[PDB]
Design an enzyme around this catalytic site. Sequence first.
Site, mmCIF file in Angstrom:
data_model
loop_
_atom_site.group_PDB
_atom_site.id
_atom_site.type_symbol
_atom_site.label_atom_id
_atom_site.label_comp_id
_atom_site.label_asym_id
_atom_site.label_seq_id
_atom_site.Cartn_x
_atom_site.Cartn_y
_atom_site.Cartn_z
ATOM 1 N N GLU A 142 -11.570 4.139 -0.870
ATOM 2 C CA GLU A 142 -11.891 4.697 0.466
ATOM 3 C C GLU A 142 -12.651 5.977 0.339
ATOM 4 O O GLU A 142 -12.277 6.920 -0.342
ATOM 5 C CB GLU A 142 -10.556 4.867 1.288
ATOM 6 N N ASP A 201 0.816 -1.204 0.000
ATOM 7 C CA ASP A 201 0.000 0.000 0.000
ATOM 8 C C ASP A 201 0.851 1.255 0.000
ATOM 9 O O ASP A 201 0.406 2.313 0.494
ATOM 10 C CB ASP A 201 -1.011 -0.034 1.134
ATOM 11 N N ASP A 234 -3.313 -3.267 -2.331
ATOM 12 C CA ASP A 234 -4.328 -2.254 -2.451
ATOM 13 C C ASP A 234 -4.224 -1.508 -3.782
ATOM 14 O O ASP A 234 -3.143 -1.405 -4.382
ATOM 15 C CB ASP A 234 -4.182 -1.192 -1.304
ATOM 16 N N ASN A 235 -5.318 -0.903 -4.228
ATOM 17 C CA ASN A 235 -5.317 0.107 -5.297
ATOM 18 C C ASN A 235 -4.987 -0.467 -6.631
ATOM 19 O O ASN A 235 -4.417 0.249 -7.482
ATOM 20 C CB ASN A 235 -4.423 1.254 -4.955
ATOM 21 N N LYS A 280 2.784 3.291 -5.842
ATOM 22 C CA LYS A 280 2.287 2.214 -6.692
ATOM 23 C C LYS A 280 3.383 1.694 -7.648
ATOM 24 O O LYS A 280 3.344 0.498 -7.991
ATOM 25 C CB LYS A 280 1.032 2.635 -7.392
HETATM 26 C C1 LIG Z 1 10.081 4.075 -1.443
HETATM 27 C C2 LIG Z 1 9.289 2.806 -0.986
HETATM 28 C C3 LIG Z 1 8.586 3.165 0.302
HETATM 29 N N1 LIG Z 1 9.055 2.714 1.469
HETATM 30 C C4 LIG Z 1 8.434 3.079 2.614
HETATM 31 N N2 LIG Z 1 7.376 3.816 2.732
HETATM 32 C C5 LIG Z 1 6.869 4.316 1.583
HETATM 33 C C6 LIG Z 1 7.445 3.914 0.315
HETATM 34 N N3 LIG Z 1 6.712 4.558 -0.661
HETATM 35 C C7 LIG Z 1 5.741 5.247 -0.109
HETATM 36 N N4 LIG Z 1 5.829 5.115 1.255
HETATM 37 C C8 LIG Z 1 4.807 5.532 2.214
HETATM 38 O O1 LIG Z 1 3.559 4.897 1.880
HETATM 39 C C9 LIG Z 1 2.466 5.868 1.846
HETATM 40 C C10 LIG Z 1 2.094 6.226 0.419
HETATM 41 C C11 LIG Z 1 1.222 5.534 -0.241
HETATM 42 C C12 LIG Z 1 0.854 5.830 -1.675
HETATM 43 N N5 LIG Z 1 -0.624 5.638 -1.779
HETATM 44 C C13 LIG Z 1 -1.315 6.233 -2.724
HETATM 45 O O2 LIG Z 1 -0.777 6.988 -3.557
HETATM 46 C C14 LIG Z 1 -2.768 6.038 -2.735
HETATM 47 C C15 LIG Z 1 -3.566 6.900 -3.498
HETATM 48 C C16 LIG Z 1 -4.935 6.814 -3.601
HETATM 49 C C17 LIG Z 1 -5.754 7.771 -4.454
HETATM 50 C C18 LIG Z 1 -5.320 9.054 -4.594
HETATM 51 C C19 LIG Z 1 -6.084 9.979 -5.355
HETATM 52 C C20 LIG Z 1 -7.122 9.493 -5.978
HETATM 53 F F1 LIG Z 1 -7.907 10.327 -6.786
HETATM 54 C C21 LIG Z 1 -7.601 8.216 -5.897
HETATM 55 C C22 LIG Z 1 -6.857 7.288 -5.130
HETATM 56 C C23 LIG Z 1 -5.609 5.810 -2.821
HETATM 57 C C24 LIG Z 1 -4.812 4.979 -2.016
HETATM 58 O O3 LIG Z 1 -5.442 4.000 -1.256
HETATM 59 C C25 LIG Z 1 -3.411 5.062 -1.972
HETATM 60 O O4 LIG Z 1 -2.813 4.141 -1.257
HETATM 61 C C26 LIG Z 1 2.989 7.124 2.589
HETATM 62 O O5 LIG Z 1 2.821 7.015 3.980
HETATM 63 C C27 LIG Z 1 4.474 7.010 2.150
HETATM 64 O O6 LIG Z 1 5.404 7.788 2.963
HETATM 65 CL CL LIG Z 2 -14.798 3.260 2.741
HETATM 66 CL CL LIG Z 3 -4.174 2.640 5.630
HETATM 67 MG MG LIG Z 4 -4.106 2.523 -0.683
#
Ligand SMILES: CCc1ncnc2c1ncn2[C@@H]1O[C@H](/C=C/CNC(=O)c2cc(-c3ccc(F)cc3)cc(O)c2O)[C@@H](O)[C@H]1O
Ligand SMILES: [Cl-]
Ligand SMILES: [Cl-]
Ligand SMILES: [Mg+2]
Length: 213
Positions: A197, A139, A167-168, A142
């Site tokens: 969500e 999660d 996820d996603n 991506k």
């Molecule tokens: C470097 C590797 C690595 N190592 C360790 N921690 C890392 C990491 N890379 C990232 N992080 C952390 O993970 C989390 C980011 C997650 C990224 N998630 C989405 O982008 C996402 C977007 C939508 C959505 C957005 C807009 C929309 F219109 C629709 C849907 C919905 C969702 O459920 C989503 O998960 C933050 O805490 C990062 O600091």
């Molecule tokens: Cl929900």
């Molecule tokens: Cl979460």
């Molecule tokens: Mg997600």
Amino acid sequence: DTKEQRILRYVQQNAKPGDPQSVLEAIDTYCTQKEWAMNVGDAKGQIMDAVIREYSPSLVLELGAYCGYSAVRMARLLQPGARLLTMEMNPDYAAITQQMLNFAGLQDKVTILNGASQDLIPQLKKKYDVDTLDMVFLDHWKDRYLPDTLLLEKCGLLRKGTVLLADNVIVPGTPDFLAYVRGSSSFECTHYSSYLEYMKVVDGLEKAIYQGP
Ligand SMILES: CCc1ncnc2c1ncn2[C@@H]1O[C@H](/C=C/CNC(=O)c2cc(-c3ccc(F)cc3)cc(O)c2O)[C@@H](O)[C@H]1O
Ligand SMILES: [Cl-]
Ligand SMILES: [Cl-]
Ligand SMILES: [Mg+2]
């Protein structure tokens, strides 16, 4: 302050310490009524609960803790003695997650690793005494799902039967990962259609069970 800090403070102000359901409900209400955030959410979360109960993993790895919503969700359903490792690169988010787990009373089940997954994954065996993982929840960013799936394999952290849950896979989507696991003899895949969500927009989880090298 930030939206993530505001979520934590709304939990503090409202939920009950030591009550993980109260924490989940607090976050969901905040993110429905006040400010959207990228927590897995209740719709997908119910599917995650069902999968976690089916497999009863002893050792789970989460990539991307964010504010700790999914870590609370999974840790609350772990059998006694089972453990969650969650990786979170953003130090502020890592501290929010730890405080959210502390508030929920789940801190003894979870280890929050503050760093980038590509740096931490190679350390798991020697530093965190991992042999192999039973389940991995993806999660984080991506475009890291496929890189990190391949790194997990390389590091010997997958066994026959390890359950990946991503996820996603519809929105925002992870096209290289999804095509990869669906095309690979090394994975057995199942799709669980759901909703993004806090939104009436289709999303889904992919379960990809590792078959061995
Ligand atoms: C470097 C590797 C690595 N190592 C360790 N921690 C890392 C990491 N890379 C990232 N992080 C952390 O993970 C989390 C980011 C997650 C990224 N998630 C989405 O982008 C996402 C977007 C939508 C959505 C957005 C807009 C929309 F219109 C629709 C849907 C919905 C969702 O459920 C989503 O998960 C933050 O805490 C990062 O600091
Ligand atoms: Cl929900
Ligand atoms: Cl979460
Ligand atoms: Mg997600």
